[PDB]
Design a protein around this ligand. Structure first.
Ligand SMILES: *[C@@H]1O[C@H](CO)[C@@H](O)[C@H](O)[C@H]1NC(C)=O
Ligand SMILES: *[C@@H]1O[C@H](CO)[C@@H](O)[C@H](O)[C@H]1NC(C)=O
Ligand SMILES: *[C@@H]1O[C@H](CO)[C@@H](O)[C@H](O)[C@H]1NC(C)=O
Ligand SMILES: *[C@@H]1O[C@H](CO)[C@@H](O)[C@H](O)[C@H]1NC(C)=O
Ligand SMILES: *[C@@H]1O[C@H](CO)[C@@H](O)[C@H](O)[C@H]1NC(C)=O
Ligand SMILES: *[C@@H]1O[C@H](CO)[C@@H](O)[C@H](O)[C@H]1NC(C)=O
Ligand SMILES: *[C@@H]1O[C@H](CO)[C@@H](O)[C@H](O)[C@H]1NC(C)=O
Ligand SMILES: *[C@@H]1O[C@H](CO)[C@@H](O)[C@H](O)[C@H]1NC(C)=O
Ligand SMILES: *[C@@H]1O[C@H](CO)[C@@H](O)[C@H](O)[C@H]1NC(C)=O
Ligand SMILES: [Mg+2]
Ligand SMILES: [Mg+2]
Ligand SMILES: [Mg+2]
Ligand code: NA
Lengths: 321, 321, 321
């Protein structure tokens, strides 16, 4: 009967179209390179006021070289002119009543205890320690540098998909509405401008610059290079997204200590101890490109051939019911 | 004959079970994301004694920002109050008998030779050089900071599988036996506590803190995120492993030089030159997640269908022999 | 007819050979790990002359720890003995005629403007600013450190393919023609020596050390670990390639600012502001290993079986035409 091949032809038309669109949708004919090879060069610009001092890029950006992880210091605590010696720790956790509870068995991971119980102040009595004196008082409140909200982060990114040796940069003058020197990234108006406003990044990440600058934090500028290397070079394009990575028992925020080391004409040494709070920026470059390949195209082919060949049989069985 | 289909049915039962368990074992129905996207924030805590000085996190940890690669300095060599000028190098490799073997052709990659053969000491005669004087004597023996064994490394890690957009952190309060503030990672008792004892990491890596602190070294804290994103969020879990990466013609260990730069009231410049030996820690985050996908499930399906269809034929041929 | 099976046997011989060589060529029987896990330790050696000063590794290499991204400073601009205060900016872009165009609305991202229009010099009138005074004059010409061309970069690299747990290092004494201590990487004579001459790297990247040292730049030392883990351990070998990553509206080159902070006996603070130009080196380790697997071998098998089975039918149809 001729209707049998019009039923079979329809079987193949319909079934083969479902299978066809699915495999064509997932790019099953493409080999994929998910090991992007990226280089990130960052540049911060701006000047702020902290206390009655002005902070420039040499003062608040650390490290200075422009790596993929850098910190913009927004608030700090200074303990000036420390010197090696003996003094009573100011932390309440070091409370003592007598030298019998200032032995090495107490607070093993903390500072070096001399073994004497001394009077830090008239209201507290703490174990004495050997180290930089006086000790740090990290329980005071200090201001934050508000001008940092208007600083700009410039991200030059040069990536390469090695499986295909397809290397490209994220400086694209034609994709940007305004000139490179004056543009400013906006997810909608200018999504390819490499210059980001610090406050903007804080908003795209859903964060309040006040609380964030107060407690410090870790934000991620995510650069995604999802590319179809079957298409034009023009089509491999970076997409920027933003997220807070520290999120959240542990106290949120981000801070670290470093000192400025000075030496007296006498030769004695003394430092300024600095506890820094800021916003660490991690440039996270993901990417995966897909190029047509004979092997995945043959495997996907064989897969779709056999699957339709069985679907037509099963559909014949379902119809005859 | 009915036995022919009981032989064929057994063929399909047995053969299909082998193929089935194999493919089900390798998760052949799963697409895999092997391009994890991780952020690492580290925090070191502790205080040590070196010579008659106390070292805190601002003194022995470098860099300070808490990156994925940091160094805990255990032994150092100081050459204090250097100043630009001329002086005889102390390295024996620079031995000379006359100014005729102190020309630019000699030791091309070394320091800047003035061209004079001078008497460093009464027992050695070396080429004179222009640079920081006096020169460094890196052949002496110095102590090591033993308290560093009791320092703790706290690793906060926030990763994301971008192919699935599955982001998670390694701070898991319910997986830890004791509180976050006081726990301490143990591969068996508390394998999810993010706080590591430096000495412990040295042991998990099979290293002696004495020799390691003496020569310096490079250890790896490996965080592995092997996950089945078909299962619950609760099941994606990090696993910590440890290894020594410098291992091993070349002299083992790890050291680097940096200076503390001071300026005299006169305006002249002088530095303290420091050769630092310590333990560099590299946090190496690997991860790959697997999620069910239609394409790999169809390809694996077609693969198992055809393979059993041939195995039953071959087994029929083997039986009739 | 017997010729029908000699035509079919030839069909299978020919068709099966094409398919066979193709699949065998692409290692379709291999699972692939493209998430290499690498550790990089670098060491720079050399001494240069800048002005009438000598720069050693502690002076021009930053950071000092030997990370995968480091900088060799070739030219710098010093602005010595700055101090907080008020002074007229030297940038022409800050030209003013009256204090009415020195308000906060002008150059929002720049320095902190006091609101006064002052005379920087007799030929220029600029807005006054609060900050480090005097201001920087980054339009002068300064020398470059030429000895940096003869510096050597030593790269120790320790990688691991985690899917197979195959870890190896790039220190291979038998693959190098000369001893480790004295060899020098050459793409042809000694392509496994880990010691690179800075000038050499500049040439492999197609760059002129003069212009590059003048403007600074970003070069990549690419380490590739393409390996067949079916073969001997001896066969997994690193291959070094080189490229300039900054390439290229934006001014090329690479520079960053950092200060040396001094304090007077009076207690007042003053710094030396340094704009550094150099060559940043990014060690980029790519790698992917292939090991035989049952699943990819079965899938590729099924793929080739079905494809030949159809090719013989299509070829029969083409012949009978
Ligand atoms: C580490 O701390 C314990 C106390 O918890 C102490 O007994 C031990 O001596 C310390 N280790 C070193 C090397 O000082
Ligand atoms: C950049 O603009 C020019 C025209 O000004 C255009 O020809 C060029 O193709 C653009 N860049 C790309 C990748 O197309
Ligand atoms: C050096 O002088 C200062 C006072 O200027 C003094 O406090 C310090 O103890 C002296 N150093 C020594 C080792 O005496
Ligand atoms: C590099 O060293 C060689 C000696 O090995 C010397 O002749 C040459 O001038 C040096 N290059 C520079 C740029 O100084
Ligand atoms: C953490 O503990 C709470 C109960 O205290 C539990 O409900 C929660 O599910 C735990 N975390 C996870 C991922 O289950
Ligand atoms: C500055 O003074 C010191 C002694 O305090 C002296 O050694 C040095 O040479 C002087 N600098 C100059 C340029 O004379
Ligand atoms: C940012 O700059 C604008 C001028 O462009 C200014 O009005 C605004 O106050 C600045 N923001 C902060 C937080 O100072
Ligand atoms: C290094 O050289 C020795 C012989 O001196 C040789 O036996 C060894 O196999 C070489 N290394 C490798 C990976 O073969
Ligand atoms: C400290 O002394 C210097 C001169 O040596 C002077 O210029 C400076 O203004 C003084 N500091 C203060 C707060 O007066
Ligand atoms: Mg404290
Ligand atoms: Mg020496
Ligand atoms: Mg300027
Ligand atoms: Na298949």
């Amino acid at each position: 009967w001729t209707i049998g091949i019009i039923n079979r032809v329809v079987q193949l038309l319909i079934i083969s179209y479902f299978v066809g669109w699915v495999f064509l949708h997932e790019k099953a004919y493409q080999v994929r390179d998910t090991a992007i090879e990226s280089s990130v060069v960052t540049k911060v610009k701006g000047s702020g006021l902290y206390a009655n001092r002005v902070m420039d890029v040499s003062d608040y950006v650390t490290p200075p070289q422009g790596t993929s992880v850098f910190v913009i210091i927004t608030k700090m605590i200074v303990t000036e002119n420390q010197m090696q010696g003996f003094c009573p720790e100011s932390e309440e956790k070091y409370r003592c009543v007598s030298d019998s509870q200032c032995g090495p068995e107490r607070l093993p991971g903390g500072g070096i205890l001399t073994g004497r119980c001394v009077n830090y102040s008239s209201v507290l009595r703490t174990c004495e320690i050997q180290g930089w004196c006086p000790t740090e008082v990290d329980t005071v409140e200090t201001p934050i540098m508000m001008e940092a909200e208007n600083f700009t982060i410039f991200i030059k990114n040069s990536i390469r998909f090695p499986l295909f040796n397809f290397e490209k940069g994220n400086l694209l003058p034609n994709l940007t509405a305004r000139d490179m020197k004056t543009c400013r990234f906006h997810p909608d108006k200018d999504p390819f401008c490499p210059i980001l406003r610090v406050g903007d990044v804080v908003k795209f990440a859903g964060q309040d610059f006040a609380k964030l600058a107060r407690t410090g934090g870790v934000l991620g500028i995510k650069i995604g290079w999802v590319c179809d290397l079957d298409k034009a070079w023009d089509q491999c394009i970076p997409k920027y997204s933003f997220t807070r990575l520290d999120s959240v028992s542990v106290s949120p925020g981000y801070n670290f200590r470093f000192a400025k080391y000075y030496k007296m004409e006498n030769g004695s040494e003394y430092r300024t101890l600095l506890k820094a709070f800021g916003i660490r920026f991690d440039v996270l470059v993901y990417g995966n490109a897909g190029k047509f390949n004979i092997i995945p195209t043959i495997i996907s082919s064989v897969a779709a051939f056999t699957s339709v060949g069985v679907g037509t049989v099963l559909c014949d069985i379902i119809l005859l019911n």
